Design a protein around this motif. Structure first.
Motif, PDB file in Angstrom:
ATOM      1  N   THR A  37      12.544  15.509   1.636  1.00  0.00           N
ATOM      2  CA  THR A  37      13.420  14.426   1.149  1.00  0.00           C
ATOM      3  C   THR A  37      13.162  13.072   1.840  1.00  0.00           C
ATOM      4  N   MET A  38      11.919  12.854   2.310  1.00  0.00           N
ATOM      5  CA  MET A  38      11.522  11.646   3.035  1.00  0.00           C
ATOM      6  C   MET A  38      10.280  10.965   2.424  1.00  0.00           C
ATOM      7  N   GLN A  39       9.978  11.276   1.175  1.00  0.00           N
ATOM      8  CA  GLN A  39       8.848  10.661   0.474  1.00  0.00           C
ATOM      9  C   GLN A  39       9.350   9.394  -0.263  1.00  0.00           C
ATOM     10  N   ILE A  40       9.177   8.209   0.359  1.00  0.00           N
ATOM     11  CA  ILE A  40       9.570   6.910  -0.205  1.00  0.00           C
ATOM     12  C   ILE A  40       8.607   6.569  -1.405  1.00  0.00           C
ATOM     13  N   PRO A  41       9.133   6.409  -2.646  1.00  0.00           N
ATOM     14  CA  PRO A  41       8.247   6.003  -3.763  1.00  0.00           C
ATOM     15  C   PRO A  41       7.775   4.535  -3.591  1.00  0.00           C
ATOM     16  N   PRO A  42       6.591   4.116  -4.094  1.00  0.00           N
ATOM     17  CA  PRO A  42       6.187   2.717  -3.869  1.00  0.00           C
ATOM     18  C   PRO A  42       7.159   1.656  -4.439  1.00  0.00           C
ATOM     19  N   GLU A  43       7.858   1.946  -5.561  1.00  0.00           N
ATOM     20  CA  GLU A  43       8.844   1.026  -6.154  1.00  0.00           C
ATOM     21  C   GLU A  43       9.965   0.755  -5.143  1.00  0.00           C
ATOM     22  N   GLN A  44      10.385   1.804  -4.390  1.00  0.00           N
ATOM     23  CA  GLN A  44      11.429   1.642  -3.370  1.00  0.00           C
ATOM     24  C   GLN A  44      10.963   0.761  -2.199  1.00  0.00           C
ATOM     25  N   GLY A  45       9.760   1.033  -1.690  1.00  0.00           N
ATOM     26  CA  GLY A  45       9.159   0.279  -0.593  1.00  0.00           C
ATOM     27  C   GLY A  45       9.020  -1.190  -0.937  1.00  0.00           C
ATOM     28  N   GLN A  46       8.600  -1.474  -2.197  1.00  0.00           N
ATOM     29  CA  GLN A  46       8.461  -2.828  -2.692  1.00  0.00           C
ATOM     30  C   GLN A  46       9.839  -3.513  -2.784  1.00  0.00           C
ATOM     31  N   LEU A  47      10.889  -2.794  -3.257  1.00  0.00           N
ATOM     32  CA  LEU A  47      12.244  -3.376  -3.314  1.00  0.00           C
ATOM     33  C   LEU A  47      12.705  -3.758  -1.886  1.00  0.00           C
ATOM     34  N   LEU A  48      12.450  -2.871  -0.913  1.00  0.00           N
ATOM     35  CA  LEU A  48      12.753  -3.077   0.507  1.00  0.00           C
ATOM     36  C   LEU A  48      12.086  -4.361   0.991  1.00  0.00           C
ATOM     37  N   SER A  49      10.790  -4.560   0.649  1.00  0.00           N
ATOM     38  CA  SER A  49      10.104  -5.818   0.986  1.00  0.00           C
ATOM     39  C   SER A  49      10.824  -7.031   0.368  1.00  0.00           C
ATOM     40  N   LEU A  50      11.200  -6.926  -0.918  1.00  0.00           N
ATOM     41  CA  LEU A  50      11.870  -8.012  -1.619  1.00  0.00           C
ATOM     42  C   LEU A  50      13.198  -8.411  -0.965  1.00  0.00           C
ATOM     43  N   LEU A  51      14.086  -7.437  -0.735  1.00  0.00           N
ATOM     44  CA  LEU A  51      15.409  -7.640  -0.141  1.00  0.00           C
ATOM     45  C   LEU A  51      15.339  -8.285   1.241  1.00  0.00           C
ATOM     46  N   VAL A  52      14.335  -7.887   2.051  1.00  0.00           N
ATOM     47  CA  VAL A  52      14.089  -8.438   3.392  1.00  0.00           C
ATOM     48  C   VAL A  52      13.782  -9.939   3.289  1.00  0.00           C
ATOM     49  N   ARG A  53      12.857 -10.283   2.388  1.00  0.00           N
ATOM     50  CA  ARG A  53      12.473 -11.675   2.148  1.00  0.00           C
ATOM     51  C   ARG A  53      13.630 -12.446   1.509  1.00  0.00           C
ATOM     52  N   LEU A  54      14.378 -11.796   0.602  1.00  0.00           N
ATOM     53  CA  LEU A  54      15.492 -12.415  -0.126  1.00  0.00           C
ATOM     54  C   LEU A  54      16.587 -12.976   0.774  1.00  0.00           C
ATOM     55  N   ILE A  55      16.977 -12.214   1.806  1.00  0.00           N
ATOM     56  CA  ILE A  55      18.055 -12.626   2.699  1.00  0.00           C
ATOM     57  C   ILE A  55      17.571 -13.406   3.917  1.00  0.00           C
ATOM     58  N   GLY A  56      16.268 -13.690   3.982  1.00  0.00           N
ATOM     59  CA  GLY A  56      15.663 -14.408   5.097  1.00  0.00           C
ATOM     60  C   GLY A  56      15.827 -13.659   6.397  1.00  0.00           C
ATOM     61  N   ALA A  57      15.641 -12.341   6.352  1.00  0.00           N
ATOM     62  CA  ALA A  57      15.766 -11.483   7.510  1.00  0.00           C
ATOM     63  C   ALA A  57      14.627 -11.693   8.515  1.00  0.00           C
ATOM     64  N   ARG A  58      14.955 -11.719   9.826  1.00  0.00           N
ATOM     65  CA  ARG A  58      13.901 -11.685  10.831  1.00  0.00           C
ATOM     66  C   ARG A  58      14.087 -10.451  11.720  1.00  0.00           C
ATOM     67  N   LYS A  59      15.315  -9.854  11.740  1.00  0.00           N
ATOM     68  CA  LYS A  59      15.618  -8.713  12.588  1.00  0.00           C
ATOM     69  C   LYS A  59      16.263  -7.589  11.803  1.00  0.00           C
ATOM     70  N   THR A  60      15.610  -6.419  11.800  1.00  0.00           N
ATOM     71  CA  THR A  60      16.111  -5.272  11.037  1.00  0.00           C
ATOM     72  C   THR A  60      16.206  -3.996  11.853  1.00  0.00           C
ATOM     73  N   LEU A  61      17.064  -3.090  11.388  1.00  0.00           N
ATOM     74  CA  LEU A  61      17.303  -1.776  11.962  1.00  0.00           C
ATOM     75  C   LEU A  61      16.875  -0.678  10.992  1.00  0.00           C
ATOM     76  N   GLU A  62      16.263   0.381  11.531  1.00  0.00           N
ATOM     77  CA  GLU A  62      15.865   1.517  10.731  1.00  0.00           C
ATOM     78  C   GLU A  62      16.263   2.820  11.412  1.00  0.00           C
ATOM     79  N   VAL A  63      16.901   3.722  10.641  1.00  0.00           N
ATOM     80  CA  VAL A  63      17.303   5.022  11.167  1.00  0.00           C
ATOM     81  C   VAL A  63      16.607   6.074  10.294  1.00  0.00           C
ATOM     82  N   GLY A  64      15.623   6.788  10.870  1.00  0.00           N
ATOM     83  CA  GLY A  64      14.797   7.801  10.195  1.00  0.00           C
ATOM     84  C   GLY A  64      13.336   7.709  10.613  1.00  0.00           C
TER      85      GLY A  64
END
Ligand SMILES: Nc1ncnc2c1ncn2[C@@H]1O[C@H](CSCC[C@H](N)C(=O)O)[C@@H](O)[C@H]1O
Ligand SMILES: NCCc1ccc(O)c(O)c1
Ligand SMILES: [Cl-]
Ligand SMILES: [Mg+2]
Ligand SMILES: [Mg+2]
Lengths: 218, 222
Positions: A37-64
């Protein structure tokens, strides 16, 4: 409820007409597919890239973290002085994660807290990092989603975005025959809790295994 | 095989029940739109809520809308905007926008919505040649499908760098993926814009399998 029929033809079309792929991302997905249950599809990874750029993020947290596909997509979207604090559950897939992050030139942007995510998150909420994250991605064991969510709410800044993976759990959350399952029950509880949680703005997306967006209100 | 969650009525009803925060105003508008000959043009409540989220997420103050209908998308957008916020909304029908204004007034957001009534082509050309050029934080494209390229190119100049362009119906009931659907103008135009977006280095891209397909195009900063 009217919807688009998700035939292989339609899913292949979404993939072909939207996924901007590269050998690094492709190779990592290929390597991960050969592992337990940890296989990220490329569409999801790309959305993650978009959202990061969208909110002008420079600092993020990841659990997993795991082989680091979600981490790589995140880091690539961050500015040159950006940072991902990645709470990696185990060291088993660390050497794989490290190889691709280095290859994609993002290893300098990724900080790994190796070990128990409950302990790293407890240290982080009591640290200088408290309320400094722009984005949080929760993708660890499903029984601990409430603990991860409550910790992420203190770690992210007001207006920050919390992203919860697998909130549909293969449809099991909606399946009445799935009774007494700890992962299903925990995801059912967090989903119900989020609906009436006035501390956040909410959107549950029918992408990949269900992706919940929770914007911390100002 | 591409693995996915089976979108049974049970799963779709679950997504709705466990995420949609509804109110009488939004519910009544959906009910009034459903009793009209072109009811299927309305965005579902999960899309309206996502629209509110994205508006608040980017700290938007000024937005563009192309295709208003009874105004559900406009209402969700305006509600998410600050008190001094503005939606510049473009639509051909005065009848559909006269319905929209009732709900906007009721939800106390009519003061936040400016309607450019008539053909969107001319409204967007006027906007590009004006003071509004490059001042919008968000653009929602949801009008006639044959004009999506024109709407997209105009939205790229109207939105600020880092601004978000949202294109509705990019899956067109799966017809874009259907090889038997040949020579259809709406399907062909959506196929062309979809293919164009994939290789368009001016934007960051995400095509979402929500509602009738929802494409997010973030205008890059450079
Ligand atoms: N050339 C054109 N100029 C302006 N509006 C147009 C147009 N062609 C179609 N439209 C409008 O596009 C709309 C399509 S439906 C828009 C749906 C709406 N955003 C919602 O949330 O319900 C209709 O209202 C139609 O009047
Ligand atoms: N559902 C097919 C009809 C249709 C036409 C225009 C729209 O914008 C829309 O959402 C739906
Ligand atoms: Cl950029
Ligand atoms: Mg996951
Ligand atoms: Mg539409």
């Amino acid at each position: 409820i009217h919807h688009v029929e998700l035939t292989q033809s339609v899913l292949q079309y979404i993939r072909d007409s939207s996924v901007r792929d590269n050998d690094i991302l492709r190779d990592l997905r290929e390597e991960t597919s050969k592992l337990p249950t940890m296989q990220i599809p490329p569409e999801q990874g790309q959305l993650l890239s978009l959202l990061v750029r969208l909110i002008g993020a420079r600092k993020t947290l990841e659990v997993g973290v795991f082989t680091g596909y979600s981490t790589l997509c995140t880091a690539l979207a961050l500015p040159a002085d950006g940072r991902v604090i990645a709470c990696d559950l185990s060291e088993e897939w660390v050497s794989i994660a490290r190889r691709y992050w280095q290859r994609a030139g993002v290893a300098d942007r990724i900080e790994v807290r190796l070990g128990d995510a409950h302990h790293s998150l407890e240290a982080l909420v009591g640290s200088e990092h408290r309320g400094t994250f722009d984005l949080a991605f929760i993708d660890a064991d499903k029984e601990s989603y409430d603990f991860y969510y409550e910790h992420a709410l203190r770690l992210v800044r007001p207006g920050g975005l919390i992203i919860l993976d697998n909130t549909l759990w293969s449809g099991k959350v909606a399946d009445p025959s799935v009774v007494g399952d700890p992962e299903t029950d925990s995801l059912r509880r967090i989903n119900a809790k989020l609906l009436t949680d006035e501390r956040v703005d909410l959107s549950m997306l029918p992408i990949a295994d269900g992706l919940t967006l929770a914007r911390k209100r100002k």
